[PDB]
Amino acid sequence: FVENSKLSKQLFDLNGQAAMHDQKIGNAIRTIDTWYEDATTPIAVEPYGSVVRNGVAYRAGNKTDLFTLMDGAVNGKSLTEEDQMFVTANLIRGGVFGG
Amino acid sequence: TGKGKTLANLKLLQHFGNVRCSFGLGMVSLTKQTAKQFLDMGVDYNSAAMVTGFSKSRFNLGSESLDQDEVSVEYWGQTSSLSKVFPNNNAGFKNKKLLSAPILVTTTDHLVKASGVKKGNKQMLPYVRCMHSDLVLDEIDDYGIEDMVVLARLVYLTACYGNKVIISSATITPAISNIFYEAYSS
Amino acid sequence: TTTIKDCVAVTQELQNWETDLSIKILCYHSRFVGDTKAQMEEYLSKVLNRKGDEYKKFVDTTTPTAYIVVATPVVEVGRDFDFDWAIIEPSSERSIVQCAGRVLRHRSSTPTTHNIHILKYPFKFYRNSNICYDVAGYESKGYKLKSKNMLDIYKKESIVNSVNRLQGDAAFYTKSLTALEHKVLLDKLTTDIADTNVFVGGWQLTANPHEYCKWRRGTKNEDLVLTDGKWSGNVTTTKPIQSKIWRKWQGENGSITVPEYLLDKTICYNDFYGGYEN
Amino acid sequence: MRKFIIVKNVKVDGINAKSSDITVGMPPATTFCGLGETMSIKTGIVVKAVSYGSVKFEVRGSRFNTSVTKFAWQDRGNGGKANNNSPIQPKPLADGVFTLCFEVEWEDCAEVLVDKVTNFINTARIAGGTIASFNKPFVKVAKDAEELASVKNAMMPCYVVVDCGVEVNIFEDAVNRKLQPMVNGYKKLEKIVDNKHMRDKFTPAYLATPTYTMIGYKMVSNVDNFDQALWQYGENTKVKTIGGIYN
DNA sequence: GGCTTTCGTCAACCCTTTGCTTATCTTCCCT
DNA sequence: AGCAATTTAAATAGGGAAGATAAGCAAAGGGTTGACGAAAGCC
RNA sequence: CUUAAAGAGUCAACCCUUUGCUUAUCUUCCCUAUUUAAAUGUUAGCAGCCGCAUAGGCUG
Hints:
By secondary structure, chain A is mainly alpha-helical. Chain A has 3 helices and 2 strands, in the order ββααα.
């Protein structure tokens, strides 16, 4: 990401050598979420099923985001294996889940 | 404006007889305009002398033969008898046009040095010019305040030898008209 | 307008001004090279001549067009110009009367509503609110207007002629432009001898009236000279906005007169508008 | 046609800051008018008005209390008590760098006028304070009003005193309109019948209570009319500006 | 007959914690 | 032994995450700055 | 002759200690730098040999 750089597109140049970000790779590890509502393709494991590119969050407003399933599991609501696997996948992804 | 002020000034000068005047005007181009009016109405270069002391390189293009414009610096004129008392027979072209002109259509800075100078003998030529010639200052309101002060000094010096001052300004302020009258009265 | 950078500010605003009107902009100040300046003069004298319809052939009058000339006080002195209308930045009342004399100078048709729109403030108000009319005006440090609002110091609707300058008023000079003008004129060109005055006596013997009363007292004024396209000093030719320029004459020789204050920075000479601060 | 002589950067220390009972700080225009008439007496150059500005001024003390002066046992007959500390009467002290501009009328060269003002100032005392330093005074003339402003701007940098007048009284408007009060003169209460303990025995003497006007500090260039900063002795046993009330 | 020294006489609070203003600058013009 | 050319255009947009806390002590002194009135030796 | 005239504020010092700002992030797509042209300015001031010459001449 650049702003004032007098150059339109930079590249991640680890010591000159062309490289790609670890977050790019780690996002591609966690592109396993095929368990949302309109499940046609795997999306990146996110607390909201959110993608910047498509401009939509596949798990927002329809009670399958990570926070409601986490609250549910904690309380006692039996999480379905896919929902359980999604919550576990977000836990090994990481992130602040408080508020 | 547009009523022919400078032509009326020449008419007023010629009402008293033959004309001997210094048309001191601001700007080079306004002196060029008054010279062109003087040329096309009745005045030749044996009586008129347009003086702009910078030798500007503004030439007329298109057709030199079909111009009928661009009043120039020749002054066939008549050399006055005062040139023999000036240094080295006055000078070349410029001071001969200054001193010996019956009608001197000039930029005004060739006349305001008559009132005096810091260093040198640059006072004598406009002094002896304004001694025997009338003074015609047109649109004196466009000058600065110190410029108008030294112009009224020139008016006082011109009136010191009986010559006639023609001021031609439409937007005159009583103050200006008054102090120019008081300079002429002194 | 009043000064050169004011003129290029009005020009650069009007060139970038989005409107349905076909604005065609000229710059007409005094800081210009020998060639360029002279060319502007001859063109303007032959297009603003309205005693006949010979100008219809020097401009494109077929298409409805706004031919706008942004100028400094070089237009209000010695110019036989005839504009349809003028917008005046206020500096002095004799400037108002002279730029009224540049509108309908050759015609005799009376205007119906209004042919002059006077600006509310000079542009030096945003730079110096203490004194703003001193540039090309008789306001100064000794003669300060109490208010700079032209509703306070001028009539809102007024037939501008020589009458306000011809009358002469010394009272209320701190809140009207005309009485400010008359005040200065009687307080500098007075019937005294002083030292820089007009009745000077006793001092003609001295060098004082030629030192403290300097004819054409200007600023230092050094001359940056253009020699065959190559400038001399710190000039740096630039490129104008090319939005609405109607006429632009090029120059190769000549000289520009730059004050020593603006010699510090580059005067940045340009083909369209001469000198500015950039 | 007006003539002025300006003494710029008059560093004075030990100024008696007690302008009156209720004013402590900058010396009022009665002090500088008294300085002007003092030179009218010693040097003979008769002074109409004085325009004074403050370059720097600090009252000695804190922001709420002035530093009192350790008094010396100088009265007669209190020996024996001289070993103890002398009792302190209230006289605040201050330092001040001033710029003075005297309206004078002179008929000789400017060099002897500058020399006379310098010889006065070398023996002068601004508000009870020793004049520590001062620049060489320079003469400037106000032929017209633009020349009056030239003299005005020649005192740069200084904060001159402009009179803003009394509406109701001093305390009220000092809070309301926030202007500064100072002694513009005095009010005579009683004729003094005992001239034995005075400076002159023939000069008539009156007990006085200081009248005050309300004033503002404006930089000399921001003052429109220089007559509103030139204080002079008015004929109401007070001092006043030539330009009257600053508006 | 003042006159100068030293000792005795008479008191009693409710304080608050920076701005005041805020600096002396270029158009014409021709040489 | 100086000569080194000109114009033309420099990217639109979408985002700059909230949730937590921000210590409690104990100190902060007074020492001089009194003028009238009244006894009371003393020139 | 400016609330004029006049005046020593001195001294002294232990701010202590303590500490988890952690957490997870897709910058990304897009595309014509195009076309010219004398390097001139003598462009070199040399190689032998005639000589005491680093004086002066000759040879191509």
